[PDB]
Amino acid sequence: ISSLELYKYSIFFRNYIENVAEDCLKNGLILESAAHNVSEVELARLKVQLKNALLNCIISYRFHGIGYVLVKTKDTLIDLEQPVNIELPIGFEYLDYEYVRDLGVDFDHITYKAVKIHKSRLIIYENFDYILKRYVPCYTESFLLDIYLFEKIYVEIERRIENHNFLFYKDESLNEGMFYTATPSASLEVIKYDLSYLKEALALIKAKIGADTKEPLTRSFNEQAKGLGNDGKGDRSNYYDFLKGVQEQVENSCNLKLTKYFGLDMKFNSLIMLSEEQKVERDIKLIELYSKYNQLIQSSSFNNEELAMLKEKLFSF
Amino acid sequence: ISSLELYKYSIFFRNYIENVAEDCLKNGLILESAAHNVSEVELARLKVQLKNALLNCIISYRFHGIGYVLVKTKDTLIDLEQPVNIELPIGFEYLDYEYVRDLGVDFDHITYKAVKIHKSRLIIYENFDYILKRYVPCYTESFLLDIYLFEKIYVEIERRIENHNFLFYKDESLNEGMFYTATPSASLEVIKYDLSYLKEALALIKAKIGADTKEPLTRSFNEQAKGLGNDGKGDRSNYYDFLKGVQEQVENSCNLKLTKYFGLDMKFNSLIMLSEEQKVERDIKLIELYSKYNQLIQSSSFNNEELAMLKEKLFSF
Amino acid sequence: ISSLELYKYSIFFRNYIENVAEDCLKNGLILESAAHNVSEVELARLKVQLKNALLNCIISYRFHGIGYVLVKTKDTLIDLEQPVNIELPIGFEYLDYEYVRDLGVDFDHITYKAVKIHKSRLIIYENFDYILKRYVPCYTESFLLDIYLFEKIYVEIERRIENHNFLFYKDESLNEGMFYTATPSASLEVIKYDLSYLKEALALIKAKIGADTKEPLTRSFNEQAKGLGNDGKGDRSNYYDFLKGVQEQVENSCNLKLTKYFGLDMKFNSLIMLSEEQKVERDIKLIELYSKYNQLIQSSSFNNEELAMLKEKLFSF
Amino acid sequence: ISSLELYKYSIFFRNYIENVAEDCLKNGLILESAAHNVSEVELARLKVQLKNALLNCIISYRFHGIGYVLVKTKDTLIDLEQPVNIELPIGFEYLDYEYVRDLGVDFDHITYKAVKIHKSRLIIYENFDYILKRYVPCYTESFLLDIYLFEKIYVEIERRIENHNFLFYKDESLNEGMFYTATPSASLEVIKYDLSYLKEALALIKAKIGADTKEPLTRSFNEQAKGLGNDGKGDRSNYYDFLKGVQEQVENSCNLKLTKYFGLDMKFNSLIMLSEEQKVERDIKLIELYSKYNQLIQSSSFNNEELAMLKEKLFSF
């Protein structure tokens, strides 16, 4: 089973690949300059390009196992080989995986099409598996088999739908709604197909898909929500933890060179976005807490030390 | 399976294509002029034309993979080849995909019917897939197969409905409600068809359609709502996120040239529209919050720094 | 399958065509004169005629793909060819589609029966599909097939109801409630038909009809409500959005020439009509909001700027 | 299938035809004189006759497609040909459809039996279908087929009820509760009929009838209510909208000539009639609203403009 052919044929596989990338950058990024000399306008334009490059970078990381983003500066096509000491980026460009040749971590350069580019100009998001000692995608052969069977169910349905029922007529001698014959041994029987096998197969395939991935839309066949809301509790969902880990890895990969070589810092906005009503409810409860604290302080005679100890053992104070 | 023939035959496919475009522009746009010299009346007329062009632009993006909108100015048919430096648009016109020839991003012109038009006069909304290295529509072959089977179920039903039941009469020698014969070996039997195959096929096809798309009307067969209301929480629906991403892409595509070449800015109104009752409830709660804050400030003795810190850690203040 | 024959035979198809037109004009229109010189009495009479013409215009738009309304002035049958600069209408008349010949948008005149009429005297409501490059009705071949099968179920029922049960008597030699014979090989058997096929077909046809249209009465077989009430929330129904889009298109089509050539403006009343009790409940809540705001303003010491900022961030104030 | 024979035979069809007419005039009318010179007593007597004529007029409109009401004045049988300029009616009389000959809208007279009557003396309620270009009744062939099958079910039941069970006795040689025979090949078997076909047919016919009409009594087989009560909300039922449209059409037809030629105006009372308890509850809530408004006005210091703006944005004030 070829992953490229399945990607071409199945929109389900395409959505499974792209949903994580879409959800990671859904709430936006924050870009900041250590020097604090770049105008916010240009910083914001650079950010938009970074989001555009990072989308394809995460997609390539999920499909191939590695992603490449070039940080373009005001330099020539030949100067890309030379390392960067300190510079301000002009933009970001995602590099296609099929046009990139990299010989490993021991080398400090890649070949792009044959333009030689130093690795200090590249943001690299890689999935290295130490048990396999190689870069691997997010899917295995079993997952490909599950998707293939899920698509093959409907191919089998299409192969038989036209003749799900037909007549079997045996006759040796050969408007009204009557079929007449004179042969005494003649027979007429309806031949019918069945779909219970495919229904059971669909149920088992759905169970396997739900067991093989954590993306909520893929498991539930677009029936469930992403579970990235605010429930007033710390018990987050599995998808939240997965997205947080992906965001942390992307942040490490980007800041490993943005800060050292380009003097920039990138951050992901919070996965959970509060609503205006929830924000107001939070302000009211905190104001009530402050009022209660003021009433306690004003109408008590606690020794200062006890007051200090209460201060450290309080979260807000 | 040809997508054009399915579009011609099936209203379900037409609705699936057009529902996203209809929902994206349902709440309207905002058009603004940086120079602040155009009268709002003409700005509003230009906006209506922009909405009309953008509807067809999103439809063509979803069906073909790319959409073209020409920004018409007070120029001649020959002057469309020349670039634009700074100008005020006279309107917007959607360009048919079949009459447009574009050789790629490396070229800065297109051919329309053979009128040569510079790309600075065109708003381009394209879906480029880096894994496939080509522009792709929103559907795949599997989705077309699902729609084809969904339509073929009822063709099969129509092929057999007239003779779902008929009589099989065997007789060698050949008002009242009695059928009489004298042959001792004669037979009379009712031949019946079955529909359990097609019912099971419909169930599986519905499950596949729900798994292959996120548009709520298409998945639920017009049984569910769009889920674009206000629930007082930040946990938005999947359709909301999809529409927000589409709106962001359209905004980038339009503002990439409206601002640089025509000095205009476009924005999408909010997907969620509050009701008058909800607006009043929000005002009451915010007034209560302000009253509580004033009571806290007036009847407390907090050091200024603590008050400042409370100010930064409050969302509203 | 011919749409005219189905319209003639089926009341279900007639209702499906006419329900949208009936619901669009159910709450009435508003007619206004820019010059503010026409008496309201004549304006109201003109409005009634406009509603009468617009009903048939929307019906023809839904059945044929285009609708024509002539704006009749105090002119002769020959003067209808000449354009209109500025005039006051005497009325409105719907023009039958079969008697109208139009050669396209490139032409500025139509032929009616052969009276030549300039297009500036005509309100045109057209459904142009850019993918098909032609005017199309609101239905496709699949929808016609569904309606045909829905009607054919009961034709099949009528074809067999009289002999759903009958006796099969075999006898070679040939009050009381006893049937007697002397032939030892004689037989007597009841022959019965079945209706499970047609019941299953009805279920599948209902599912297909619900999937192929958004009109709530057609989908639910007159079992559901139109969903155009007030729920105190912004989450409107799909039918509301569809009717709003239709109303917007009709408003654009009418005002494209009523204002430029006749100095008139037309508007649709709101789809949602509040009840008297709901209106009172709204007044009470807004008065409570104003009282709370007055109490906040009177008993606080907020700096003016803060008060201003609260004013902009409040919806009502 | 003949509609007259079905009307003769079926009370269900008669009720379906007459229920709309009965519900339209159930709450009464209002008759007013523009001159304000007729005594209310005579106006009320004229109203009763108008209701009596309008009942049959709506029945004829529903059964035939057109209805005729003559406005009788103090004139002779020959003077009915002459037009009316200004006159006061002496009464109203419904004219039978079968005795009326009308050649179309292009003619201004009809023939009644051969008395020639000018159309200015006639109230005409017609259902013209522009797609069919003819006057049509409220039913189609499919609805007639449904009613015919509904009646034919019980005819089939009556055709077999006496011999639903009978004995089949085979015997070649031919108090106690024992049937004895000596023939060794003799047989005795009970022959039974079945009713599952007719039960399923009844279910499907009920579904079709509910889909083909909006009258709640006809759809539910007299099991549901008319849904014309007060629910404190604006979400009215489908039957309410249908009756409102019928009332509006009847009002237009009557006032098209009552006002121009006879100086009279007719109106329909409201479809929804409030109960005494509901009226009291409404008064209490409005008095509470007025008290709250007075308290707000008396104990506030709002600038006059703000007070004015609150006045326009309030429904009651």
PDB file of N, CA and C in Angstrom, chain C residues 7-9 11-12 14 19 26 56 96 99 150-151 154 162 164-165 177 179-182 184 186 192 195 199 217 221-222 224 226 275 278 282-283 290 294, chain D residues 129-130 132-133 140 142 152 156 159-160 166-172 174 191-192 194 197 200 204 208 210-211 213-214 219 232 234 238 241 299 301-302 315-316:
ATOM      1  N   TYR C   7     -45.689  18.811 -12.558  1.00  0.00           N
ATOM      2  CA  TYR C   7     -46.377  19.943 -11.953  1.00  0.00           C
ATOM      3  C   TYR C   7     -47.884  19.796 -12.126  1.00  0.00           C
ATOM      4  N   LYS C   8     -48.314  19.346 -13.306  1.00  0.00           N
ATOM      5  CA  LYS C   8     -49.734  19.125 -13.559  1.00  0.00           C
ATOM      6  C   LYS C   8     -50.307  18.039 -12.658  1.00  0.00           C
ATOM      7  N   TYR C   9     -49.555  16.961 -12.460  1.00  0.00           N
ATOM      8  CA  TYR C   9     -50.070  15.776 -11.786  1.00  0.00           C
ATOM      9  C   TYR C   9     -49.940  15.865 -10.268  1.00  0.00           C
ATOM     10  N   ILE C  11     -49.516  17.608  -6.597  1.00  0.00           N
ATOM     11  CA  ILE C  11     -49.658  18.784  -5.747  1.00  0.00           C
ATOM     12  C   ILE C  11     -48.435  18.969  -4.856  1.00  0.00           C
ATOM     13  N   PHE C  12     -47.695  17.890  -4.601  1.00  0.00           N
ATOM     14  CA  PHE C  12     -46.492  17.971  -3.786  1.00  0.00           C
ATOM     15  C   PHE C  12     -45.442  18.823  -4.479  1.00  0.00           C
ATOM     16  N   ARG C  14     -46.081  21.112  -6.805  1.00  0.00           N
ATOM     17  CA  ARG C  14     -46.618  22.470  -6.825  1.00  0.00           C
ATOM     18  C   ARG C  14     -46.341  23.198  -5.515  1.00  0.00           C
ATOM     19  N   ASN C  19     -43.959  27.239  -2.067  1.00  0.00           N
ATOM     20  CA  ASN C  19     -43.846  27.537  -0.638  1.00  0.00           C
ATOM     21  C   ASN C  19     -42.813  28.625  -0.366  1.00  0.00           C
ATOM     22  N   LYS C  26     -44.608  36.777   2.980  1.00  0.00           N
ATOM     23  CA  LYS C  26     -45.620  36.542   4.006  1.00  0.00           C
ATOM     24  C   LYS C  26     -45.757  37.709   4.979  1.00  0.00           C
ATOM     25  N   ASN C  56     -45.492  35.855  -8.460  1.00  0.00           N
ATOM     26  CA  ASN C  56     -45.341  35.138  -9.718  1.00  0.00           C
ATOM     27  C   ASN C  56     -43.914  35.225 -10.253  1.00  0.00           C
ATOM     28  N   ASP C  96     -45.436  36.585 -18.444  1.00  0.00           N
ATOM     29  CA  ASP C  96     -45.294  35.142 -18.574  1.00  0.00           C
ATOM     30  C   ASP C  96     -43.980  34.781 -19.254  1.00  0.00           C
ATOM     31  N   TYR C  99     -44.020  33.768 -23.071  1.00  0.00           N
ATOM     32  CA  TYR C  99     -44.252  34.822 -24.048  1.00  0.00           C
ATOM     33  C   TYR C  99     -43.114  35.832 -24.126  1.00  0.00           C
ATOM     34  N   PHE C 150     -41.976   8.767  -5.708  1.00  0.00           N
ATOM     35  CA  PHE C 150     -42.926   9.007  -4.630  1.00  0.00           C
ATOM     36  C   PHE C 150     -44.357   8.912  -5.141  1.00  0.00           C
ATOM     37  N   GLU C 151     -44.611   9.430  -6.340  1.00  0.00           N
ATOM     38  CA  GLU C 151     -45.938   9.295  -6.921  1.00  0.00           C
ATOM     39  C   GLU C 151     -46.207   7.897  -7.466  1.00  0.00           C
ATOM     40  N   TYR C 154     -47.863   4.875  -5.110  1.00  0.00           N
ATOM     41  CA  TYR C 154     -49.304   4.730  -4.945  1.00  0.00           C
ATOM     42  C   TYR C 154     -49.992   4.258  -6.222  1.00  0.00           C
ATOM     43  N   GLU C 162     -57.135  -4.452  -5.581  1.00  0.00           N
ATOM     44  CA  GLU C 162     -58.364  -5.229  -5.724  1.00  0.00           C
ATOM     45  C   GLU C 162     -58.116  -6.730  -5.576  1.00  0.00           C
ATOM     46  N   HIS C 164     -55.297  -8.131  -3.948  1.00  0.00           N
ATOM     47  CA  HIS C 164     -54.225  -8.403  -2.999  1.00  0.00           C
ATOM     48  C   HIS C 164     -54.303  -9.831  -2.458  1.00  0.00           C
ATOM     49  N   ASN C 165     -55.516 -10.373  -2.367  1.00  0.00           N
ATOM     50  CA  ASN C 165     -55.760 -11.760  -2.019  1.00  0.00           C
ATOM     51  C   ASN C 165     -56.734 -12.380  -3.024  1.00  0.00           C
ATOM     52  N   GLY C 177     -70.669 -21.855   4.264  1.00  0.00           N
ATOM     53  CA  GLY C 177     -69.290 -21.636   4.636  1.00  0.00           C
ATOM     54  C   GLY C 177     -68.397 -22.835   4.446  1.00  0.00           C
ATOM     55  N   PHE C 179     -66.602 -25.313   1.399  1.00  0.00           N
ATOM     56  CA  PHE C 179     -66.300 -25.563  -0.005  1.00  0.00           C
ATOM     57  C   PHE C 179     -65.975 -27.042  -0.180  1.00  0.00           C
ATOM     58  N   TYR C 180     -66.776 -27.728  -0.993  1.00  0.00           N
ATOM     59  CA  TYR C 180     -66.712 -29.174  -1.153  1.00  0.00           C
ATOM     60  C   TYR C 180     -66.297 -29.569  -2.564  1.00  0.00           C
ATOM     61  N   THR C 181     -65.500 -30.633  -2.647  1.00  0.00           N
ATOM     62  CA  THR C 181     -65.080 -31.222  -3.906  1.00  0.00           C
ATOM     63  C   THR C 181     -64.865 -32.713  -3.692  1.00  0.00           C
ATOM     64  N   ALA C 182     -64.890 -33.456  -4.794  1.00  0.00           N
ATOM     65  CA  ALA C 182     -64.716 -34.897  -4.757  1.00  0.00           C
ATOM     66  C   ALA C 182     -63.428 -35.377  -5.413  1.00  0.00           C
ATOM     67  N   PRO C 184     -59.644 -36.149  -5.621  1.00  0.00           N
ATOM     68  CA  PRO C 184     -58.682 -36.376  -4.531  1.00  0.00           C
ATOM     69  C   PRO C 184     -57.401 -35.574  -4.679  1.00  0.00           C
ATOM     70  N   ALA C 186     -57.421 -32.407  -5.796  1.00  0.00           N
ATOM     71  CA  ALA C 186     -57.812 -31.005  -5.849  1.00  0.00           C
ATOM     72  C   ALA C 186     -57.007 -30.168  -4.858  1.00  0.00           C
ATOM     73  N   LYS C 192     -51.303 -14.238  -2.040  1.00  0.00           N
ATOM     74  CA  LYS C 192     -51.209 -12.956  -1.353  1.00  0.00           C
ATOM     75  C   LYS C 192     -50.053 -12.134  -1.902  1.00  0.00           C
ATOM     76  N   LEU C 195     -46.288  -5.733   0.626  1.00  0.00           N
ATOM     77  CA  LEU C 195     -46.037  -4.300   0.495  1.00  0.00           C
ATOM     78  C   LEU C 195     -44.747  -3.857   1.177  1.00  0.00           C
ATOM     79  N   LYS C 199     -42.915  -0.012   1.233  1.00  0.00           N
ATOM     80  CA  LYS C 199     -42.673   0.690   2.489  1.00  0.00           C
ATOM     81  C   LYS C 199     -41.211   1.095   2.603  1.00  0.00           C
ATOM     82  N   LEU C 217     -41.204  22.112   5.080  1.00  0.00           N
ATOM     83  CA  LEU C 217     -42.484  21.460   4.805  1.00  0.00           C
ATOM     84  C   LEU C 217     -42.341  20.312   3.808  1.00  0.00           C
ATOM     85  N   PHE C 221     -42.700  16.242   5.053  1.00  0.00           N
ATOM     86  CA  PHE C 221     -44.054  15.916   4.591  1.00  0.00           C
ATOM     87  C   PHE C 221     -45.119  16.659   5.403  1.00  0.00           C
ATOM     88  N   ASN C 222     -44.932  17.971   5.535  1.00  0.00           N
ATOM     89  CA  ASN C 222     -45.827  18.866   6.270  1.00  0.00           C
ATOM     90  C   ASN C 222     -45.911  18.552   7.764  1.00  0.00           C
ATOM     91  N   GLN C 224     -43.286  19.253  10.075  1.00  0.00           N
ATOM     92  CA  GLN C 224     -42.496  20.204  10.839  1.00  0.00           C
ATOM     93  C   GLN C 224     -42.972  21.632  10.594  1.00  0.00           C
ATOM     94  N   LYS C 226     -42.000  25.879  10.153  1.00  0.00           N
ATOM     95  CA  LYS C 226     -41.071  26.588   9.281  1.00  0.00           C
ATOM     96  C   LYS C 226     -39.834  27.074  10.023  1.00  0.00           C
ATOM     97  N   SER C 275     -43.900  38.780  19.232  1.00  0.00           N
ATOM     98  CA  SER C 275     -45.235  38.883  19.807  1.00  0.00           C
ATOM     99  C   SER C 275     -45.349  40.044  20.808  1.00  0.00           C
ATOM    100  N   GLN C 278     -43.606  39.316  23.980  1.00  0.00           N
ATOM    101  CA  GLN C 278     -42.156  39.353  23.864  1.00  0.00           C
ATOM    102  C   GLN C 278     -41.658  40.793  23.795  1.00  0.00           C
ATOM    103  N   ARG C 282     -39.021  42.622  26.407  1.00  0.00           N
ATOM    104  CA  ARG C 282     -37.837  43.323  25.941  1.00  0.00           C
ATOM    105  C   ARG C 282     -37.763  44.725  26.537  1.00  0.00           C
ATOM    106  N   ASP C 283     -38.894  45.423  26.600  1.00  0.00           N
ATOM    107  CA  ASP C 283     -38.911  46.757  27.188  1.00  0.00           C
ATOM    108  C   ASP C 283     -38.532  46.720  28.667  1.00  0.00           C
ATOM    109  N   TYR C 290     -31.144  50.242  31.809  1.00  0.00           N
ATOM    110  CA  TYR C 290     -30.949  51.681  31.938  1.00  0.00           C
ATOM    111  C   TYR C 290     -30.919  52.100  33.401  1.00  0.00           C
ATOM    112  N   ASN C 294     -27.807  53.904  35.293  1.00  0.00           N
ATOM    113  CA  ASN C 294     -27.950  55.154  36.030  1.00  0.00           C
ATOM    114  C   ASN C 294     -27.455  55.010  37.464  1.00  0.00           C
TER     115      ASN C 294
ATOM    116  N   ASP D 129     -53.438  29.826 -12.213  1.00  0.00           N
ATOM    117  CA  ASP D 129     -52.090  29.277 -12.181  1.00  0.00           C
ATOM    118  C   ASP D 129     -51.359  29.693 -13.451  1.00  0.00           C
ATOM    119  N   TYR D 130     -50.284  30.470 -13.295  1.00  0.00           N
ATOM    120  CA  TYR D 130     -49.619  31.036 -14.461  1.00  0.00           C
ATOM    121  C   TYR D 130     -48.796  29.995 -15.201  1.00  0.00           C
ATOM    122  N   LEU D 132     -49.795  26.859 -15.565  1.00  0.00           N
ATOM    123  CA  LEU D 132     -50.779  26.123 -16.345  1.00  0.00           C
ATOM    124  C   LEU D 132     -51.659  27.027 -17.197  1.00  0.00           C
ATOM    125  N   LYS D 133     -51.669  28.335 -16.915  1.00  0.00           N
ATOM    126  CA  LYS D 133     -52.442  29.317 -17.677  1.00  0.00           C
ATOM    127  C   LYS D 133     -53.932  28.977 -17.681  1.00  0.00           C
ATOM    128  N   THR D 140     -55.313  17.880  -6.986  1.00  0.00           N
ATOM    129  CA  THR D 140     -54.753  17.349  -8.222  1.00  0.00           C
ATOM    130  C   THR D 140     -55.197  15.900  -8.415  1.00  0.00           C
ATOM    131  N   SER D 142     -53.235  13.294  -8.092  1.00  0.00           N
ATOM    132  CA  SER D 142     -52.616  12.424  -7.093  1.00  0.00           C
ATOM    133  C   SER D 142     -53.433  12.404  -5.813  1.00  0.00           C
ATOM    134  N   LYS D 152     -61.174   2.721  -1.051  1.00  0.00           N
ATOM    135  CA  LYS D 152     -61.230   1.397  -1.660  1.00  0.00           C
ATOM    136  C   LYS D 152     -60.757   0.319  -0.699  1.00  0.00           C
ATOM    137  N   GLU D 156     -62.707  -3.260  -0.213  1.00  0.00           N
ATOM    138  CA  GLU D 156     -62.060  -4.565  -0.288  1.00  0.00           C
ATOM    139  C   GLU D 156     -62.320  -5.368   0.981  1.00  0.00           C
ATOM    140  N   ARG D 159     -65.678  -6.836   0.793  1.00  0.00           N
ATOM    141  CA  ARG D 159     -65.801  -7.877  -0.219  1.00  0.00           C
ATOM    142  C   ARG D 159     -65.426  -9.259   0.302  1.00  0.00           C
ATOM    143  N   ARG D 160     -64.688  -9.345   1.423  1.00  0.00           N
ATOM    144  CA  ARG D 160     -64.211 -10.632   1.915  1.00  0.00           C
ATOM    145  C   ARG D 160     -64.567 -10.954   3.370  1.00  0.00           C
ATOM    146  N   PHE D 166     -63.157 -20.181   5.980  1.00  0.00           N
ATOM    147  CA  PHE D 166     -64.111 -21.202   5.548  1.00  0.00           C
ATOM    148  C   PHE D 166     -63.395 -22.540   5.432  1.00  0.00           C
ATOM    149  N   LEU D 167     -64.180 -23.613   5.344  1.00  0.00           N
ATOM    150  CA  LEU D 167     -63.658 -24.975   5.339  1.00  0.00           C
ATOM    151  C   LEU D 167     -63.532 -25.509   3.917  1.00  0.00           C
ATOM    152  N   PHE D 168     -62.426 -26.201   3.650  1.00  0.00           N
ATOM    153  CA  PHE D 168     -62.176 -26.870   2.376  1.00  0.00           C
ATOM    154  C   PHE D 168     -62.217 -28.372   2.633  1.00  0.00           C
ATOM    155  N   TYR D 169     -63.272 -29.024   2.151  1.00  0.00           N
ATOM    156  CA  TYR D 169     -63.531 -30.431   2.433  1.00  0.00           C
ATOM    157  C   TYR D 169     -63.380 -31.239   1.149  1.00  0.00           C
ATOM    158  N   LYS D 170     -62.553 -32.286   1.204  1.00  0.00           N
ATOM    159  CA  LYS D 170     -62.346 -33.210   0.094  1.00  0.00           C
ATOM    160  C   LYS D 170     -62.781 -34.601   0.531  1.00  0.00           C
ATOM    161  N   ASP D 171     -63.745 -35.175  -0.186  1.00  0.00           N
ATOM    162  CA  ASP D 171     -64.276 -36.491   0.163  1.00  0.00           C
ATOM    163  C   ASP D 171     -64.858 -37.097  -1.105  1.00  0.00           C
ATOM    164  N   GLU D 172     -64.253 -38.183  -1.589  1.00  0.00           N
ATOM    165  CA  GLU D 172     -64.658 -38.707  -2.886  1.00  0.00           C
ATOM    166  C   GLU D 172     -65.946 -39.512  -2.788  1.00  0.00           C
ATOM    167  N   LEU D 174     -68.367 -39.225  -0.504  1.00  0.00           N
ATOM    168  CA  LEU D 174     -69.521 -38.437  -0.086  1.00  0.00           C
ATOM    169  C   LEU D 174     -70.168 -37.728  -1.271  1.00  0.00           C
ATOM    170  N   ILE D 191     -59.445 -22.305   5.352  1.00  0.00           N
ATOM    171  CA  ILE D 191     -58.861 -21.338   4.430  1.00  0.00           C
ATOM    172  C   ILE D 191     -59.037 -19.948   5.024  1.00  0.00           C
ATOM    173  N   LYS D 192     -57.935 -19.210   5.167  1.00  0.00           N
ATOM    174  CA  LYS D 192     -57.942 -17.923   5.850  1.00  0.00           C
ATOM    175  C   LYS D 192     -57.402 -16.828   4.942  1.00  0.00           C
ATOM    176  N   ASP D 194     -55.973 -12.623   4.688  1.00  0.00           N
ATOM    177  CA  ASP D 194     -55.047 -11.806   5.462  1.00  0.00           C
ATOM    178  C   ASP D 194     -55.337 -10.328   5.227  1.00  0.00           C
ATOM    179  N   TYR D 197     -51.659  -6.502   3.975  1.00  0.00           N
ATOM    180  CA  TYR D 197     -51.559  -5.639   2.805  1.00  0.00           C
ATOM    181  C   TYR D 197     -52.348  -4.350   3.001  1.00  0.00           C
ATOM    182  N   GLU D 200     -50.787  -2.009   5.744  1.00  0.00           N
ATOM    183  CA  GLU D 200     -49.643  -1.290   5.203  1.00  0.00           C
ATOM    184  C   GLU D 200     -50.079  -0.230   4.194  1.00  0.00           C
ATOM    185  N   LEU D 204     -49.349   3.867   4.357  1.00  0.00           N
ATOM    186  CA  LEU D 204     -48.737   4.639   3.287  1.00  0.00           C
ATOM    187  C   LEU D 204     -49.680   5.718   2.771  1.00  0.00           C
ATOM    188  N   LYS D 208     -49.108   9.773   2.647  1.00  0.00           N
ATOM    189  CA  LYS D 208     -49.257  10.560   1.428  1.00  0.00           C
ATOM    190  C   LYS D 208     -50.253  11.696   1.621  1.00  0.00           C
ATOM    191  N   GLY D 210     -50.992  13.184   4.445  1.00  0.00           N
ATOM    192  CA  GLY D 210     -50.344  14.195   5.257  1.00  0.00           C
ATOM    193  C   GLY D 210     -49.331  15.003   4.477  1.00  0.00           C
ATOM    194  N   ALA D 211     -48.708  14.395   3.469  1.00  0.00           N
ATOM    195  CA  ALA D 211     -47.754  15.142   2.670  1.00  0.00           C
ATOM    196  C   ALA D 211     -48.413  16.036   1.630  1.00  0.00           C
ATOM    197  N   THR D 213     -51.333  17.835   1.805  1.00  0.00           N
ATOM    198  CA  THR D 213     -52.193  18.917   2.254  1.00  0.00           C
ATOM    199  C   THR D 213     -51.678  19.460   3.577  1.00  0.00           C
ATOM    200  N   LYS D 214     -52.133  20.666   3.907  1.00  0.00           N
ATOM    201  CA  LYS D 214     -51.725  21.370   5.111  1.00  0.00           C
ATOM    202  C   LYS D 214     -52.845  21.511   6.133  1.00  0.00           C
ATOM    203  N   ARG D 219     -54.972  15.784   7.585  1.00  0.00           N
ATOM    204  CA  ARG D 219     -53.713  15.056   7.690  1.00  0.00           C
ATOM    205  C   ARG D 219     -53.751  14.038   8.825  1.00  0.00           C
ATOM    206  N   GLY D 232     -48.027  32.849  23.198  1.00  0.00           N
ATOM    207  CA  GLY D 232     -47.113  33.880  23.640  1.00  0.00           C
ATOM    208  C   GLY D 232     -45.855  34.050  22.830  1.00  0.00           C
ATOM    209  N   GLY D 234     -44.232  34.372  18.490  1.00  0.00           N
ATOM    210  CA  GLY D 234     -44.521  34.670  17.108  1.00  0.00           C
ATOM    211  C   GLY D 234     -44.433  33.521  16.129  1.00  0.00           C
ATOM    212  N   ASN D 238     -48.319  26.376  10.372  1.00  0.00           N
ATOM    213  CA  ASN D 238     -48.466  26.440   8.920  1.00  0.00           C
ATOM    214  C   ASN D 238     -49.913  26.705   8.522  1.00  0.00           C
ATOM    215  N   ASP D 241     -50.678  30.424   8.731  1.00  0.00           N
ATOM    216  CA  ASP D 241     -50.179  31.167   7.581  1.00  0.00           C
ATOM    217  C   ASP D 241     -51.051  30.938   6.354  1.00  0.00           C
ATOM    218  N   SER D 299     -36.442  58.761  38.911  1.00  0.00           N
ATOM    219  CA  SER D 299     -35.224  58.634  39.705  1.00  0.00           C
ATOM    220  C   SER D 299     -33.976  58.537  38.835  1.00  0.00           C
ATOM    221  N   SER D 301     -31.128  60.899  35.989  1.00  0.00           N
ATOM    222  CA  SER D 301     -30.659  62.203  35.535  1.00  0.00           C
ATOM    223  C   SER D 301     -30.112  62.119  34.116  1.00  0.00           C
ATOM    224  N   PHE D 302     -30.788  61.369  33.249  1.00  0.00           N
ATOM    225  CA  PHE D 302     -30.352  61.192  31.872  1.00  0.00           C
ATOM    226  C   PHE D 302     -30.586  62.468  31.056  1.00  0.00           C
ATOM    227  N   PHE D 315     -40.352  49.578  22.305  1.00  0.00           N
ATOM    228  CA  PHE D 315     -41.504  49.233  21.477  1.00  0.00           C
ATOM    229  C   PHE D 315     -42.773  49.918  21.977  1.00  0.00           C
ATOM    230  N   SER D 316     -43.009  49.882  23.288  1.00  0.00           N
ATOM    231  CA  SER D 316     -44.240  50.436  23.839  1.00  0.00           C
ATOM    232  C   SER D 316     -44.230  51.961  23.874  1.00  0.00           C
TER     233      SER D 316
END
